[PDB]
Every structure is written in C-alpha cells, then in structure tokens.
Amino acid sequence: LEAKKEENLADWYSQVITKSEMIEYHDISGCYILRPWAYAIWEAIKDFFDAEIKKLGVENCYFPMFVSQSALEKEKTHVADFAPEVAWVTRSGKTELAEPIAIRPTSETVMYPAYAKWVQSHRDLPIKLNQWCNVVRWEFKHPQPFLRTREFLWQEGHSAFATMEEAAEEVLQILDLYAQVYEELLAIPVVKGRKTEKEKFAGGDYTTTIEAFISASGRAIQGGTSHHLGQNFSKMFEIVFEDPKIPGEKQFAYQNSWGLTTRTIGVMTMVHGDNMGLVLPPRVACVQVVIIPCGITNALSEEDKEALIAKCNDYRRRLLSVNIRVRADLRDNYSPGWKFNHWELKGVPIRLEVGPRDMKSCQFVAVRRDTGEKLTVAENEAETKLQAILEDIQVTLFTRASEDLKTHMVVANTMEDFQKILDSGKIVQIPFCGEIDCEDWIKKTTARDQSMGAKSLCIPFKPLCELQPGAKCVCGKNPAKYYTLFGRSY
Amino acid sequence: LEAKKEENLADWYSQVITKSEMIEYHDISGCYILRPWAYAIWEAIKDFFDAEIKKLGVENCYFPMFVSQSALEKEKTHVADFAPEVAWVTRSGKTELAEPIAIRPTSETVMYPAYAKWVQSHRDLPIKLNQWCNVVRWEFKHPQPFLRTREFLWQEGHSAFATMEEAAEEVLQILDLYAQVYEELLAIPVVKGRKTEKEKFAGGDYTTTIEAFISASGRAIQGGTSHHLGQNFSKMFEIVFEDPKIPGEKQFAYQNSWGLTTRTIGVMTMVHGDNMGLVLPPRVACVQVVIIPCGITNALSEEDKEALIAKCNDYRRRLLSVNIRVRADLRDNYSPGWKFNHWELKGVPIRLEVGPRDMKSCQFVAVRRDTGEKLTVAENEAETKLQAILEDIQVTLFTRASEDLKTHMVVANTMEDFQKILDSGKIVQIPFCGEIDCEDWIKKTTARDQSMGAKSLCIPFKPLCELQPGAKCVCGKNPAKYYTLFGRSY
Ligand SMILES: O=C(C[C@H]1NCCC[C@@H]1O)Cn1cnc2cc(Br)c(Cl)cc2c1=O
Ligand SMILES: O=C(C[C@H]1NCCC[C@@H]1O)Cn1cnc2cc(Br)c(Cl)cc2c1=O
Ligand SMILES: [Zn+2]
C-alpha cells in the first residue's frame, strides 16, 4: 500500500479495494466487478437480513427490471428530478422498438400496479415482499467503487397493510435490522433518526434513517433507509379494499418501503481500514482464520515438511468443526512472508502461524489483524482461544469507531460554534426549527466558509442533549423543534 | 382449473401458473413476475447447487450486466446469429450517449477480458467463478412464462484451467449436478449426452447436455448445459501464462462454462401437473405440509374452537422441529373446503387435516397431493409417518415420469420406423452418422409429414441399444457413428 488514509484518502481507498482483490474496474466507468472477497461480505449481509425479515413474515420474490414508459410517466411516482438518470432500451439488435423501456432504478412503478391486483378483498393484506436485485441509476459525478456507482446490488422491501399501526411498527423494526447489519456484523456504529422534511423521501409521509460517520474524511454517510408511505401510492395505483365493518366504503392501504445497498462494503472499508490494508470484522469475512505454514527451509527434512503440512490440516479440520471459516494456505510457490502480507491486505482477522519450532513444543502462534498482537497458544486450546480472539476483534473494531464517533459528534447551540466544529471535520447536533429555509439556508452559509456545506443527516431519536425551555434555531428567528444532526455528506 | 392438460395444454399451463400464485404477467410481454411460490423453488435449486459447486472450489461473484459495444463487436464471441436479440441502452434521460451499451445475454464478453488480467503467473490458475444473475435476450416468438421469456434468472459458471484433464473433469462433474437438480429435487428424469456438431455451442470444443421429456406434448426440453471451450476464448481474449518447465513458451488456458435457468420450474410444472393443479416435489416446496383445521360449525363451543386451533400448533411446532416446512392455515374467513382447494392448486404435498372427531381419538388425517390418498395417523406418530409420506411422494413422482419416459423413448433403425414413432408423439434413438447434412436433412424430411420436425437432442452416454457391426445412418448413405436421440423440441 503506497497511499495513506490520512493523506490521499481518494487513492488509499482505490488501492485497498483492488489490492484486496475486492473490486475490478470495467470497460465502462461507473461499473465495477464484485470479486469474491467482496461478494462474500454482501452474501454475509444477505444471509443475516434474509433470515430476519422472514421471521417478520416477509417473502422474497423477483419482479422484472424493465419498467415501460407508460408506467413511470403514466403516474408521477417521481419526484421527477431523477428522471434524467434513467437509462433506456430502444433497439433489439438494429430493429427499432415500439416504445422505449427503462432499467429499474427502483421498483415502485413495476410492483405497485400488481399490488393493486392482488389486493382484492381486505383478506389479501398484508402484502410484504422483498427482492434482492441489481438497480441502475446514471451518474456523471466522478464514480466510486462502492459509494458512487452506476449499477449496484441491493435489497428492496415493499409492504402494504390495512391499518397504519401495522405499517408504523414494521418501519422501525426494519431500521433496527439495518442497524444490526452495521453494528453487529460490520461493527460500525450508526445514528438512528428521522429525515427532515427537506430530505425525506418525497411522495412518502416520513423517513427513518441510519447514518454513519467516516472520520477519515469528516463526512458522514447514509446506511440504509426505511420509509412509511401511508396512502400516497395506494391512491396513485388504486390499491384498495372494502373496509372492515364500514361497509360499502373504500379504504386505501398503508404502505412501507425500505432498502439497503452494497455501499455497506464501502463504509466497512472506509471505517476499519489501515495503511496496512483492508480490515474485516470476523462476522463477515470469507476467511476468519488463515493457516500459514512458516519456518520452511531449502534443506528441511522431507518427512518433516509433511508433518507440518499435516499439522496445519488438523487445525483446519478442528476449526471447521466449530464453524470458524478457515483456509490453510499450503501453496508451495509463495513465501511465508509473502502470504503474511497477502492475507493482511485482504484483512483476514487471524493468521494462524505454524512452525516446527512450535510443533516441537506441541503449540502455535496467532496474529490479530487489527492490533498486530501475536499470541502463543496450546494445540489443545486452538478452538476456545481462537473463537475468543475472533469475538474480541469484533468488539475492538466496534468499540473503536464508536469512540471515534463520540469524539466527532457533538452539540453546538450557536451558529458560530457550528461553523467552527463543522470545519473541525466533525458532525453536529444543533437546535433546529425544521423549516426548509433554515436548512436550505444553512447549506449556503456553511458552504461560504468551508468545498461544500452541511446537510441535514437525521433527527436523532435519542439526541445528545435535551432542549431547554426557550431555545431557537441557529438562524435566530424561530424556536427549535428538535436537536438535529447536520454535517457534510457523501 | 377449467382447461385440461390432455386437451388445451397451452391454456392449462397458463392457468396452473397463475392460479397457483407463481406467475403474474407484466405490462411488457415476454416479462413475468416471479411470485414467492415460484421463487422459493428457484431458491431451493439455488441452495442445493450453490452448496455443491463450492465443494468443487468455485466461488461466487458479480460482474456487471452492461457490456460495451467495443466488446462484443471488438471480438467475435458470437456466433453473431443471436446479435439481433440484444437490447441496447442509448440515452440517459433525454441526453444521448457516447456509445450504446448492451444488456448481458451471457457474460463471456464481460468476464473474459478480466480473466486475462488475473491470470498472470501460472499460479493464478485455476479460476472458477459463478454468478447468479438475470439475463436478457429478445424474442418476438410468442412468449411463455418459464420456457420462452425475455428476461430470466440463471446461474453461469466460467472456469479456466492450465491443463485439459482438469477442465474435462469439471464439465462432467457439473452435468451430474444439473442431473441431481432434475432427478433428486425436481423428480424429473433426464438423458445425459453430447450435443451434435450441428447443435453444440459454437465457439467451444464440445457440449454435454441434459434433456428431459414433457410427454404432455411429445416434445423434449433442454435442462442445463455444460461446455468445454478448450482454448478458443483464451486465444480470443489472450488468457495466457508462461508454461511450467517449458520455459519462455506461451500456453493458452483451457476453459469451461455451464448454465442452468428458471426453465426448471416450467419443466417441473409441465411434468408433474394435474388438472387439479400444480404438483410440487417435497424437496422444493415452500410448504411441504399444510395444516388445516376442519369440522368447524356455527355453534361449536368457543373453548373447543381454541383446542383445535391449538392442537394444530402442536403439529406445527413438532414438525418444524424435524425440518418439515409446515404452514398452519388458521384463517377465520375462508372455508375449510376452500383451503383444501387453494393449497391443492399450489400443489402442497400433504394436507394435514385436523378435526375434533379425530381430536377425540387423539389422532389426525393426512392427504397426499399426488395420489389423493388419505391416511389416518396417530398423534404420537406425526413426525415419522409424515416424513415418510414426503419421501414416498418424491419417489412416486420420479418413478412415474421415468416410466413415462421409458414408454416414450425408443430405438428405431429404419427411417420409416422413425417417422412413425416420432409422429407417435415420442422421441427416438436412431443410428446416426454425425454429418450436419444427415441431420440438417432429417429436420426437413420429418417436417414434411408431421407443425415442425425432429431435432437432435443429445448423443446418450448410455444409449438403449448397442450398435451392430455394419450399420448405417437413417439416410442410407454413411455408416452410423453412434445411436443418437432425436425429437421435436422446445
Ligand atoms: O429508492 C428510492 C425509493 C424507494 N426504493 C425502494 C427502497 C425504499 C426507497 O424509498 C428513492 N429513489 C432514489 N433514487 C431514484 C433515482 C431514480 Br433515476 C428514480 Cl426514477 C427514482 C429514485 C428513487 O425513487
Ligand atoms: O449461453 C450461451 C453461452 C454460455 N453462457 C454461459 C453458460 C454456458 C453457455 O454456453 C450460448 N448463447 C445463447 N444465447 C445467446 C444469445 C445472445 Br443475444 C448472445 Cl449475444 C449470445 C448467446 C449465447 O452465447
Ligand atoms: Zn431556523
């Protein structure tokens, strides 16, 4: 690794993700190749989430990606600001086509006409459906492998209830899951809260979100979102049912929608990385432990060279049997020292080092990726001790970026504190009125002193300080409705 | 179900797949919605396969879907017959675009430039990679939900070895897996063999395949394919490595590729269906057993109506604990008799019927979907007996369509037998020379008497009869190289 996090972050990231065999650039910019080392992290997230939404009664499915012109345009889901970012299909070979078709940037326009058809009785509710798919949005903005890409993978859930007490409960349930993905797997602490009326999903009553901080840049980033849509789309798409014991009457259904994307892997990179390379949390690594045989020489007995290469498999065998994801790298051509480095770039949590010097002592050595600390372990304790080190790494990585968050997230009550602490490369809870103006304003004000300015992130469900009796927005005109998280974003 | 399999098959299928809540048509023909009842079958296939290729050392990944014009066209992967079936992206919103981009119809053109880059040393081999993704091919041919669709889901593996003994072994390993999917899960017997030089994947040395018979129509269908590519693509894309102990020399890598698609679900439907509806093999059903409470009346004691609805959960609880996938349908608004029918269309293998008459006798009743046979079972035997019935159904469905295959697959040595037995709505092993002509010919000959004519299916690895000393192609000119499976196809 030539570049350094503190110094040229933009380069560091692009070097870490290539040299860890995670990403590979494609002959079309904005598009990237998810190599196995990264995909296994996505698949790890996928396994957890999938397991939890199904406990909630959600079922997976697959809708088409092609949304016809008379669909987006036929309605006004959009919110048509994004309309110049949709790609279009126009010709089948050379032969032109009847109407052009769009590539899904999201799936409301494809799914909701159908929801309308399936909801006949009130009996056909709820309808909770999820899909794991790719989506395509267009961007000329200088692209970036996990955070700013043209095609990406995600998950999008769309549920639809009779009542609102229902819909409401799910929205918060899902956001907790999205938290668990970041806090329990990825070991990334996040801030839960509600979008401002400026920022919330348009065409949807409210919008809960999960925001994480990437100190390295002093910006914060959006993790995943969970929206309550109320009746907006049902009205739009006539998803209606005859009421319960309010006969002859027409009730609109209450809807939700929530998504999480592959930016997770980018955030995970940005947060836990070294100048030594990528670092993975034990919960998501393809390989929790790598077993490398070291201490091999040109004239090492040939019957010894197969005691080593066999001792290694005993660890491999024993660890696999306690569901530790272990590879033994028994490759003849690379050095040991080469391997040490290779698996360090990739960020494998523990390196299990096996030398004959240690074999003699019926023992072995384990190296933590995060701290670098070596430990010498008895062969009869490989399971308990290594499982423990895996748990202790997860904690460390989490109880680091969280202390790193607490330093970098503070309250400021004047506007003059807020421009100092923001330029201090941090993020701030301020008193805020809520009006779009004293936000729409705030951006321009902060941008004049900073190459851009503070955005609202979320309105913390649990803000740092409680608000005091008379208290005013940073503007100085209106009173403060709620402490509100602001910062420069991604 | 109004239509009937024997009578209007084209309608039967379209009714079965809608009324079993599997498929839902979209505002663009050729495109369909995979509802949960179907997707869970795809996901079941996915779970099995994924588990097996990983034992083989394959790793999953995700390449982009956008293949640039200077890629397909830059090379000649194609085999350009299919070129007028590729969709194209041309505008980002209204703004036109630099060059147009294609939607992946397959991924050789996207993956192989990269394979070239990753294979530097000979050390970087093998490279076995898989991806589960959607692909888009265009068709005006009257579409059909699982068998003839424009967008579909599949899996595509692309491996790349130094030697050919390697590549060769995998091709056959994979085809056995594809067999297992059809024979062990889907309970559909298939015929293993090699494509003819007419039919094989172009741009690839040979092509093993799996062919299944859909009696209902007298046609056969392609299950999945596994190709050996040898050196064609490496040469094309310069995937090269310095040789082992043949220094200073340039070796091309040997490649494979293999795919399986969502047509599986269509074949599964076509093969096992009733006029009573879809039928699922226990190995893939979202719901192996449905628990329905029956024998409820208007004036049934309220404390009895909760002994029933509780007895049901005891079965639910006990079955879930032996990994039987069970739903208890406790819905208050539908009749019992309505439920019986609903879950019959969906093809749930067993209906677990709970009535108080049986509760009195501390017992219950189970109905097989395939045969219709009812059985009365002790409450202390619910696990062993139901698991057994699930196993016995799988077998039945398999040892049915297999006897149905043996009737409908026969040998014919003259050409005059072959035109009779083919028009008998069956498929035939004939003596065949191999020349494209005496195949290219065979189609036109059979088409003049039949609304189209026999195609080669495969060249059985284990043909019905052995060939006799002097023996000639059905044409009568050349000698027969091998018994070869022919028939009308899909
Ligand atoms: O992504 C969304 C809408 C919903 N999609 C499913 C997950 C929950 C989420 O609120 C917001 N969004 C974001 N970007 C977009 C870009 C384009 Br282009 C279009 Cl057409 C539409 C959108 C767009 O609708
Ligand atoms: O699907 C293939 C090529 C390979 N894809 C991966 C699985 C193994 C398989 O042999 C054959 N095929 C089939 N249909 C096609 C349609 C179009 Br359009 C194009 Cl460009 C290309 C193709 C095309 O290459
Ligand atoms: Zn204000």
Ligand SMILES: [Zn+2]
């Ligand atoms: Zn011939």
